Design a protein around this ligand. Structure first.
Ligand SMILES: C[S@@+](CC[C@H](N)C(=O)[O-])C[C@H]1O[C@@H](n2cnc3c(N)ncnc32)[C@H](O)[C@@H]1O
Length: 430
């Protein structure tokens, strides 16, 4: 039971990609006439639109700059053959670089991983076109905000995808995350050691201490959380400080859990989006705070990232980031192999400060929190060693041994001053 606010958001999603351009040819697949007309009125006289009411009709649409599909795939999401027919027809109908905006409510779908499974399917699907392949490039998954605020529904999704050419092996950044470090089994094993809802050292108590280093925060202020993981940090920021928190993560595995949990527990201060924080188009001058907890070691282009954060902060706004970093000790081969397998792009505090100054941040604070990181590992390790019997009731031996040796290994990395745990904070001037 949606309102006109939804259709306006769909067009906003479209404009993240095409910007100020108006699309020459638009297709609309939308079975609900009132929702369909609200969409149509969003376009002006420079746009010609063809729309249809059943998915089989996409074969009749072509040379589209954009295809908007709204609540039309109820059957397809339960039938891979029908889904395949739609994706194929959708790709054929679009020009290269054409945008697909797909809105589908998943709240009546009992499978909680459905959004994640659909996203990989879209990301992986390939269609022969000419002497190569075509497919959809992933941009984002957003929540329909009307659905959150009016219907307490956090599982109403909008995918933003773009048609691109592909060769006829080569893994996207998102898939590396979902297939390697942040798998489901990895997530539940990680959550167990760090603490409920957290994938970062020290769990609830530690995250609260870090949030406090922002200084005074007020109810209703807006925070962007980069690399929100399974949501523990965002949810705590909202419940403890009354912040409105928007969390982003590139890993669908991670966010599936965050989304499931907020959808069940219900807190309208918290929303989530799947996207790459180095690329996604955030609204400028809009956030009071940007927070990132142990995320940015995954991110190569720190320079780009900082300019985007700066851009996104309100003047006078504050950024606070913690991250894995590299120390000033002689790097060991074990540490170097560890970094490559994780694909971390590590920096030291000096480099972070240089970049922050170059970006234009003021009041820069940096801290080496490695001694704290050490206390946490030791404390965490004493817990597992004590609760050995309880772990094997839930997970396998293989997950367990990797934890003991991993914890053993990080301790040596800290000892050699290879591995650091860094704190950075700063403010946007004015
Ligand atoms: C070690 S975890 C931290 C989770 C969260 N900070 C917490 O305390 O529970 C890293 C998270 O950052 C996310 N991440 C890595 N690169 C990202 C990117 N380019 N954009 C958005 N999120 C990213 C990963 O998906 C992962 O979920």
């Amino acid at each position: 039971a949606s309102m006109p606010a939804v259709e306006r958001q769909l067009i906003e999603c479209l404009h993240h990609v095409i910007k100020g351009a108006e699309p020459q040819q638009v297709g609309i697949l939308c079975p609900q006439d009132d929702q369909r007309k609200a969409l149509t009125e969003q376009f002006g006289s420079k746009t010609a639109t063809s729309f249809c009411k059943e998915v089989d009709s996409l074969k009749n649409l072509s040379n589209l700059d954009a295809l908007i599909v709204n609540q039309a795939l109820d059957e397809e999401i339960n039938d891979s053959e029908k889904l395949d027919k739609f994706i194929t027809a959708a790709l054929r109908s679009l020009r290269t670089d054409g945008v697909l905006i797909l809105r589908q409510d998943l709240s009546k779908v009992k499978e909680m991983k459905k959004m994640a499974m659909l996203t990989d399917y879209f990301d992986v699907f390939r269609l022969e076109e000419g002497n190569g392949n075509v497919g959809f490039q992933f941009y984002a998954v957003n929540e329909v905000l009307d659905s959150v605020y009016v219907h307490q529904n956090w599982l109403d999704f909008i995918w933003t995808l773009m048609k691109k050419p592909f060769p006829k092996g080569v893994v996207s950044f998102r898939d590396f995350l979902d297939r390697t470090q942040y798998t489901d089994t990895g997530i539940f094993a990680y959550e167990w050691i760090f603490g409920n809802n957290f994938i970062s050292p020290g769990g609830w108590n530690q995250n609260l201490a870090i949030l406090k280093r922002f200084g005074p925060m007020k109810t209703g202020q807006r925070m962007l959380d980069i690399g929100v993981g399974i949501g523990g940090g965002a949810r705590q920021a909202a419940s403890e400080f009354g912040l409105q928190v928007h969390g982003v993560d590139l890993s669908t595995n991670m966010l599936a859990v965050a989304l499931e949990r907020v959808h069940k527990e219900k807190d309208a201060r918290v929303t989530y989006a799947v996207c790459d924080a180095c690329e996604y188009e955030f609204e400028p001058n809009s956030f009071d705070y940007v927070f990132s907890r142990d995320c940015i070691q995954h991110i190569k282009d720190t320079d780009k990232l900082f300019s985007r954060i700066y851009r996104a902060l309100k003047p006078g706004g504050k950024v606070l980031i913690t991250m894995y970093g590299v120390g000033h000790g002689t790097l060991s081969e074990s540490f170097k192999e560890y970094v490559s397998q994780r694909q971390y792009y590590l920096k030291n505090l000096e480099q972070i400060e240089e970049i922050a100054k170059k970006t234009g941040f003021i009041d820069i604070e940096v801290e080496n929190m490695t001694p704290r990181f050490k206390e946490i590992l030791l404390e965490e390790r004493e817990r597992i060693e004590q609760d050995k019997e309880t772990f094997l009731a839930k997970f396998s031996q293989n997950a367990y041994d990797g934890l003991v040796s991993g914890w053993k290994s990080k301790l040596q990395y800290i000892a050699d001053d290879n591995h650091n745990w860094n704190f950075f904070a700063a403010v946007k001037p004015q």
